[PDB]
Amino acid sequence: MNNLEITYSTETEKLRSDVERLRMSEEEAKNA
Amino acid sequence: RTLKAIVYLQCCYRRMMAKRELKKLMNNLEITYSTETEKLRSDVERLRMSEEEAKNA
Amino acid sequence: QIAEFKEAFSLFDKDGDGTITTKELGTVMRSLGQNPTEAELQDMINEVDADGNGTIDFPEFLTMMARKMKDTDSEEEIREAFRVFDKDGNGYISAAELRHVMTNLGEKLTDEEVDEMIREADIDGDGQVNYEEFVQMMTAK
Amino acid sequence: QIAEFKEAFSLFDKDGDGTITTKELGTVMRSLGQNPTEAELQDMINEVDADGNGTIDFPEFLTMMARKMKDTDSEEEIREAFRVFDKDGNGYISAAELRHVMTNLGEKLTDEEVDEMIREADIDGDGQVNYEEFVQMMTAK
Amino acid sequence: AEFKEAFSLFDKDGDGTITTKELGTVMRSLGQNPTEAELQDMINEVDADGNGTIDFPEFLTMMARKMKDTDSEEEIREAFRVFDKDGNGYISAAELRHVMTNLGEKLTDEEVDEMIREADIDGDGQVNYEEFVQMMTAK
C-alpha cells in the first residue's frame, strides 16, 4: 500500500515536465 | 449531456435494486519503477547532451 | 458497518456454506450501499483467485471492497439524475415516459426491474411522477 | 492447503479482528512453509493495498501470495547449506562454531534465535553437531 | 456512418420510425455535419413527399445515395478566415457576431451570446479567433 503510490505518482510528473524540456531544447537546437 | 447521464443513473438504479436483495436474503508493481527509473536516467543524459550541443551551437 | 453487512451476507448465503455464488457479487455490493455498474464487477473479477472461484466467502469480499474502495465509493456521489420528456418544465413526467427511458435507453432495464421500482415510487392518480422527488427517493440512503 | 493455512492465520490473529499486524506478514509466510528474506518482505510491501494498512486480512494475504508465487516458491528449493570450520572433513562442528557463523556472519541471527534453534537440533554429549543431519533437519518439510 | 443503436435512441416509442424533421439531428448524432440546405436537398430528391416519418432502411438509402457530400462534412479539422488579413490573430466581437448572425445559415443572437460566455475580450474589443474556434470544436 499507500506509502509507495505517492512517490511513483510524483515520478510520472518528472518524465512529463522533462520531455517538455527536451522537446523545447530540440526546438531551440533546431532553430539554432 | 443525455445518454451518459442516463447510463450513470441506470448503474445507480441497479445498485439500489440489489440493496434490497441483501436485506431479504506486491510483485506486480515493483516491475514498473525499475524500468521507469532507467528511463529518466537515460533521458537526463539526453537533455544534458542537448544542453551541451546547444551551448556549442 | 460489519455487523449489518455480515447479517446481510448471512442472508445471501442460502445453503449456509459460508460462501455465496460469484454471480451474486454485484447483488451484495449494492446491498451494503454502493452504486457500481455490471462492468466494474467483471473488471474486479479479473483476479486469479476470484476468477477461478465458484463461490466467495465474507473475508474474500471484504478484501475486494478494500482494494477497490476508491472506485466503489465514487459510485455513491450522485444525487442528481437526468430527465428528458418534460420540455415545458412542469416538473413532472408520465409513468409511460419513465418506463421508456429506463427500458429503451442506456443500459436497458427490464420491465420487471421497472415494476419492482414503481412499488416504492409515489405515482399520483393522474399517472404522473414528480421527477425531483423521485430522484431524491432513489438517492436517499 | 487453505484449511491448515486458515487455522494458522486464525491463531496469528490474537484480538480476533480477522486481521493481523502488517509487521507479522513475514512471520505468517514462513509458516505456511516458505523461505523468503526480510528484504523480500519489504520489497513486497510496495503495492497500493498493504503499506498504508496497519493490519492485513487473510484474503489480502492470499492475493499477495498469488502475485509473488514464483519468487515465494523459489525459496523452498534449497536443502544444502554451507559450512566453514571443519577443514579436516570430520562431518561435525561444535555448538560454539555454529553459534559464531549464525550470529557473527551474514544476516546475523540473535543468540535467542540460535537458542530457540538448538532446542530441535541433535547435539551429542561432547557438544558437537553432525552438520549433514542438521542441514537435513532444517530443510525437512 | 449508419448506426442502429443511435436510431433506437431517436425512436423513443419503438415504432421503428422517426419524424422526417428529425432527419438533420439524426445525421448530426451519427457523426456528419450536413448544412440545413443539404438536409433539405436530400429529403427533396426522394419522393418522401407525403412521408411523415422515416424508417432505418429509408435513412440508410439516403446516406448511401449522398455518401460523398456527407463524408465531406467530416473531413475538416481546421478553419481559416478571411476576416483578418493583417494577420493580427484577432477579430472584433462585432465582426464575429455579424458573421454568425448575418451571414450563411444564421445563428440567433441568443446562440451567439451562449458562445461568447467565458470567451475573453480585450480592451480593443477583440477575441483570439483561433482559441475561440478550438474552444467551440474541441469540446
Added chain:
Amino acid sequence: AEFKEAFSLFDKDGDGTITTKELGTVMRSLGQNPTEAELQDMINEVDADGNGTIDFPEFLTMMARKMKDTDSEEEIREAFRVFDKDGNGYISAAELRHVMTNLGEKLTDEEVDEMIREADIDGDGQVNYEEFVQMMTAK
C-alpha cells in the same frame, strides 16, 4: 577501501585481531589486488617484527600509508600481451602455461589446470587469450 564488516568475517573468534599471514587475503577481500611482494614490503616497513596478529587499527594504518600503491592495483580493466606480435589473437596453451607457472609470482600447475578447464583449444593448440582473460576476470 577499509571495511570493518570484512574484518569481522576474518576475525572468526571475535578476539579483535587476525593473523599477520592473513594480511594478503584481507586486502584481496576488500577490493585491492596487491602482489605477494607488495604484501611482504608493507609488513616489513612496519616494526610488526614480533607481531603475531593485526588489529583493525593496525591494518587501517598500513592501508593509509600505502594507499597510492594499493589503489594502482585496482585501476586496471584491460590486459595486453606481448606474447602475440603477429596479432593473431591466439596464444599456444604451452606459452600460456609457461607465463603462468614459470614467469613472475608463479602459479602451480594445478592452479593453471583449473583455469584451462572449459577453455576451448583449437587443432593448432592455441587459445583465444582475449576471451580467456575476460572469462577469468569477468566472473
